[PDB]
Amino acid sequence: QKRREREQHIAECMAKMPQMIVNWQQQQRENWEKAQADKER
Amino acid sequence: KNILVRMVSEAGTGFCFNTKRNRLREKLTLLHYDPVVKQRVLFVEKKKIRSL
Amino acid sequence: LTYFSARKGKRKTVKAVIDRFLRLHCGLWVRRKAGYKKKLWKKTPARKKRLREFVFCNKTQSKLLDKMTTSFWKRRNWYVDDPYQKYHDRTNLKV
Amino acid sequence: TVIVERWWKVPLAGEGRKPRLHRRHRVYKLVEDTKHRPKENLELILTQSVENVGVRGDLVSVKKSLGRNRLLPQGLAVYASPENKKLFEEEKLLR
Amino acid sequence: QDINDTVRLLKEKCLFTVQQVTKILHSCPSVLREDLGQLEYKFQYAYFRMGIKHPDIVKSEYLQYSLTKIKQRHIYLERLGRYQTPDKKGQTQIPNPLLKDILRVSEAEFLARTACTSVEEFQVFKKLLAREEEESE
Amino acid sequence: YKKKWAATEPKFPAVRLALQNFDMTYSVQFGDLWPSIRVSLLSEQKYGALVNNFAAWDHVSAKLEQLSAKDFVNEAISHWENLRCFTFDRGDISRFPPARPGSLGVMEYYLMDAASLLPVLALGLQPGDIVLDLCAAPGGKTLALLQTGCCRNLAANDLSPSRIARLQKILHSYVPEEIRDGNQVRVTSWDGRKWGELEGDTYDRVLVDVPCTTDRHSLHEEENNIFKRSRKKERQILPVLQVQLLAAGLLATKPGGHVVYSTCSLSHLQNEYVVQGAIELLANQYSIQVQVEDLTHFRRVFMDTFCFFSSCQVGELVIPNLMANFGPMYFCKMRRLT
RNA sequence: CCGAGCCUGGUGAUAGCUGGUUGUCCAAGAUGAAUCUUAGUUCAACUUUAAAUUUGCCCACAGAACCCAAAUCCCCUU
RNA sequence: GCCUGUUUACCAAAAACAUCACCUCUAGCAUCACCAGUAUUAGAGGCACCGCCU
RNA sequence: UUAAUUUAUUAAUGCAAACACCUGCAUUAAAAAUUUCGGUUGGGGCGACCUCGGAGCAGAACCCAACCUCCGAGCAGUACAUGCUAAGACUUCACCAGUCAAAGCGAACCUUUGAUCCA
Ligand SMILES: [Mg+2]
Ligand SMILES: [Mg+2]
Ligand SMILES: [Mg+2]
Ligand SMILES: [Mg+2]
Ligand SMILES: [Mg+2]
Ligand SMILES: [Mg+2]
Ligand SMILES: [Mg+2]
Ligand SMILES: [Mg+2]
Ligand SMILES: [Mg+2]
Ligand SMILES: [Mg+2]
Structure with missing residues (x-):
């Protein structure tokens, strides 16, 4: 039971993982874009 | 100074690894290789382990 | 150590040795490296790998440990699935 | 009552032999003092009418102080032994 | 018990004579209301840090005043250099101002004659000292 | 014994x-x-x-x-x-x-400390002027000089590798890679006393914040307190080091260039005697004339934020006050006329 | 024979300190680290004994750094 | 150093200790000391006969 | 004694326990009890030092002292494969500890401080 609970939780998190990775990278890039916009003023 | 913090896998695994981040800096989210999953995944800072 | 116990007259074992060292029957002593669990965050990966290893002892260190333990700890133990069963004996050793 | 416990475990003595105690076995820690336990009640069977408790032959839980200082010494109550319960049961059914 | 322990603090842990204790309880019974520990701190502040002796403490009713006011004025004087803790010999380079001049008087005369500073400076010092006490706790 | x-x-x-x-x-x-x-x-x-x-x-x-x-x-x-x-x-x-x-x-x-910014504002950093910080490496005035323009070149020197590392830390924290990597920032750990020989008549604006008694920190911190009884000899020789460093700065500054002598002490000995002795020594041993520039206008301008001791003949002294606990800070502007 | 009596016992107290340690004869045998440690000890080096088998020392040529001397290390032969 | 006294039996007899006098502190009380006492009392400490000025 | 560790014992209180006396448990004191006095240097002082590292002494493999002559450090920046494994080696004259590393697997395409026990 514990093994399958771990397996299913891991499967769900892995299903979400690529989307979360893309979102985090996009947030970092947009923060950098905001920094450049601030530099432009 | 810097603080040692426990980055916990966001992949649901019990996997955690310790990194060093400045105290004044924001909480850390970092891509790291999860051995159990065998794939790079996000890790989020959970709690401060110590101050160094 | 106690060479002659007050109740049996026997030689005693230094249990601090038993808590730290593994004796391979052939006469070798295995140990962990000191600090292998200490402040790993500031140790390089190579240093951590060196510290995580099981290491043999000197001849004089082995002699000291042999003196500090009794013959019970120096016997053949046929444990079920001993990870050190293969290491308990030496092979192809010239002198 | 003060209840104590050895800090140091006493080695087993055997079957017919008596444990051999040493200086360290005279060191105790107080595990409990019974006098600080919450008060429990005494079961009594009344023999005479008494205010705010009962009349006669009814099992009553009274504070041990009252039961031992007023009821029992004066004969107003009797211990709730099986014999007393039986006797008062015959008394009740004979009415 | 409260009265007894207050008197016992005044006698044993503060070394006030019986007559001095009666004088204290007669001039300012608020000491009884004031909790232990705080009273001991006040007395030791007078004794060690301020260098006052029991006769002068009783004469000036130092125990009557509040600890916050006492600190606010004494620390101001000390940092200003107008007050110096008596040395081991009990002597000082300059005679210290009298406790009547320190605590009994109002803020105006206190800053005009003993400190010779400005009211605004005193307010700033009071706020700073309050912050210091908060941080110390 | x-x-x-x-x-x-x-x-x-x-x-x-x-x-x-x-x-x-x-x-x-x-x-x-x-x-x-x-x-x-x-x-x-x-x-x-x-x-x-x-x-x-x-x-x-x-x-x-x-x-x-x-x-x-x-x-x-x-x-x-x-x-x-x-x-x-x-x-x-x-x-x-x-x-x-x-x-x-x-x-x-x-x-x-806001007081450790007046010397920067009084040095008169003009655009396109080469700047030196002879010994000032606590950060502070150095970072203030850095945060002045993107069209200026600055060198910072201090004998102490620890203080140089501290400067480096603050630089990585505040100054971006663009400016820090650029030549605009040049840090060194050499002795300022010999800076006159190392570079002479090179720099246009110099800041000489000689090691000082740092009175406030001396009263605050027991560690490495300059007034510890054993280190009396070093305390006594401080004036010589201060005079030598100011002389080195005056030698390194260009003819007609400007220097600011700075100190975090109230001592007249370390404030006015230092500058006068440096002028005398550098006008006799080196025959170079230096003129002390008036900062009375600067005093009036910054009177609202700081309280200044007026009796000091040469230089300006920001004395701490309860209303503005910003001092101490002594600074003197000196133009090398030759 | 009192800065804490005397006697007995624990007690053969403990002493990294001093002193002592008794037949004959032969042989081998001499100047670092840590340590509340430098009046001591443990490890090393040296030393002794016994055993295994196979190179050991000496050693020319070649070889061992830029910055800014005497020599040394290494080893074919012998 | 007030005094007569005391002291290191066995290297010190003293200016040291005590001492009347004085000051300070503590105590409102009985059946084994204090005491068969009771604030002009008792216990403790300091100081030094005494007397004159500040 | 404002050295460390205790409050067993008394005295106070407080809380329970028995309905003045007494038991248990706490706190604060008094009284005491037990125990310790690091090392190297410094005769006219009012301390300095103790670990690690760089340079000279010590010129050319290694190694070499000092109350010797000088200097520096108790980390930061970086990234988060800065992972895992593993031949063979070096080694601060012991040990402890400390270094380097082919091949291989896996991602990708880094430049100093401290043991054990105990938590
Ligand atoms: Mg005798
Ligand atoms: Mg003996
Ligand atoms: Mg011979
Ligand atoms: Mg030690
Ligand atoms: Mg010894
Ligand atoms: Mg006499
Ligand atoms: Mg005599
Ligand atoms: Mg006599
Ligand atoms: Mg005599
Ligand atoms: Mg080695």
């Missing part, structure tokens, strides 16, 4: 020793202002906030103004004739929130 002695000295802590030295000297120096200076020194210190020109300067200024701090620097250049340091009003004791990394990745502001 003789173990037993008839009498031993009281064994004062270094803080009390510094207090006794200050009481016996500054009392005479300042007369009736000494009690005020003393209480200010012993009380908390008023920290100014210097925004990082290499960050969201407008946003940080807005946040500080919301915190009710005002840029004393802004409304000073107008009368005196990029630097922006926000300080609370006279009497206010409000602290500044601890600095945090900014959106650009650099610390938004530096919490530093």
Whole structure:
């Protein structure tokens, strides 16, 4: 039971993982874009 | 100074690894290789382990 | 150590040795490296790998440990699935 | 009552032999003092009418102080032994 | 018990004579209301840090005043250099101002004659000292 | 060795020793202002906030103004004739929130003694002027000089590798890669006394913040207190080192160039005798004339934010006050006429 | 024979300190680290004995750094 | 150093200790000391006969 | 004694326990009890030092002292394979500890301080 609970939780998190990775990278890039916009003023 | 913090896998695994981040800096989210999953995944800072 | 116990007259074992060292029957002593669990965050990966290893002892260190333990700890133990069963004996050793 | 416990475990003595105690076995820690336990009640069977408790032959839980200082010494109550319960049961059914 | 322990603090842990204790309880019974520990701190502040002796403490009713006011004025004087803790010999380079001049008087005369500073400076010092006490706790 | 002695000295802590030295000297120096200076020194210190020109300067200024701090620097250049340091009003004791990394990745502001910014504003950094910091490597004035323009070249020197590493830390924290990597920033760990020989008549604007008694920190911190009884010899030789460093700065500055001698001490010995002895030594041993430039206008301009001791003939002394616990800071502007 | 009596016992107290340690004869045998440690000890080096088998020392040529001397190390032969 | 006294039996007899006098502190009380007492009392400490000025 | 560790014992209180006396448990004192006095240097002082590292002494493999002559450090920046494994080696004259590393697997395409026990 514990093994399958771990397996299913891991499967769900892995299903979400690529989307979360893309979102985090996009947030970092947009923060950098905001920094450049601030530099432009 | 810097603080040692426990980055916990966001992949649901019990996997955690310790990194060093400045105290004044924001909480850390970092891509790291999860051995159990065998794939790079996000890790989020959970709690401060110590101050160094 | 106690060479002659007050109740049996026997030689005693230094249990601090038993808590730290593994004796391979052939006469070798295995140990962990000191600090292998200490402040790993500031140790390089190579240093951590060196510290995580099981290491043999000197001849004089082995002699000291042999003196500090009794013959019970120096016997053949046929444990079920001993990870050190293969290491308990030496092979192809010239002198 | 003060209840104590050895800090140091006493080695087993055997079957017919008596444990051999040493200086360290005279060191105790107080595990409990019974006098600080919450008060429990005494079961009594009344023999005479008494205010705010009962009349006669009814099992009553009274504070041990009252039961031992007023009821029992004066004969107003009797211990709730099986014999007393039986006797008062015959008394009740004979009415 | 409260009265007894207050008197016992005044006698044993503060070394006030019986007559001095009666004088204290007669001039300012608020000491009884004031909790232990705080009273001991006040007395030791007078004794060690301020260098006052029991006769002068009783004469000036130092125990009557509040600890916050006492600190606010004494620390101001000390940092200003107008007050110096008596040395081991009990002597000082300059005679210290009298406790009547320190605590009994109002803020105006206190800053005009003993400190010779400005009211605004005193307010700033009071706020700073309050912050210091908060941080110390 | 003789173990037993008839009498031993009281064994004062270094803080009390510094207090006794200050009481016996500054009392005479300042007369009736000494009690005020003393209480200010012993009380908390008023920290100014210097925004990082290499960050969201407008946003940080807005946040500080919301915190009710005002840029004393802004409304000073107008009368005196990029630097922006926000300080609370006279009497206010409000602290500044601890600095945090900014959106650009650099610390938004530096919490530093507002008094340790007047020498920078008095050196008169003109655009396209080569700048030297002979020994000033606590950060502070150095970072202030850095946050002045993107069209200027600056060198910072200090014998102490620890202080140089501290400068490097603050540089990585505040100065971006663009400026830090560029030649605009050149850091070194050499001896300033020989800087006259190392470079001569090279720099246009020099800042000589000689090692000083740092009176406030001396009273605050027991560790490495300059007034510890054993280190009396070093304390006594401090004037010689200060004179030598100022002479080296005056030698390195170009003819007609400008230097600012700076100190964090109230001592007239370290304040005016240093400059006069440096002038004498550098006009005799080297036959180079230096003129002390007046900063009375500067005093009036910054009177609102700082209290200045007027009796000092040469240089300007920001004395700490309870209303503005910003001092101490002695600074003298010297133009090399030859 | 009192800065804490005397006697007995624990007690053969403990002593990294001093002193002592008794037949004959032969042989081999001499100047670092840590340590509340430098009046001591443990490890090393040296030393002794016994055993295994196979190179050991000496050693020319070649070889061993830029910055800014005497020599040394290494080893074919012998 | 007030005094007569005491002291290191066995290297010190003293200016040291005590001492009347004085001061300070503590105590409102009985059946084994204090005491078969009770604030002009009792216990403790300091100081030094005494007397004159500040 | 404002050295460390205790409050067993008394005295106070407080809380329970028995309905003045007494038991248990706490706190604060008094009284005491037990125990310790690091090392190297410094005759006319009012301390300095103790670990690690760089340079000279010590010129050319290694190694070499000092109350010797000078200097520096108790980390930061970086990234988050800065992972895992593993031949063979070096080694601060012991040990402890400390270094380097092919091949291989896996991602990708880094430049100093401290043991054990105990938590
Ligand atoms: Mg006798
Ligand atoms: Mg013996
Ligand atoms: Mg021979
Ligand atoms: Mg030790
Ligand atoms: Mg010894
Ligand atoms: Mg006499
Ligand atoms: Mg005699
Ligand atoms: Mg006699
Ligand atoms: Mg005689
Ligand atoms: Mg080695």
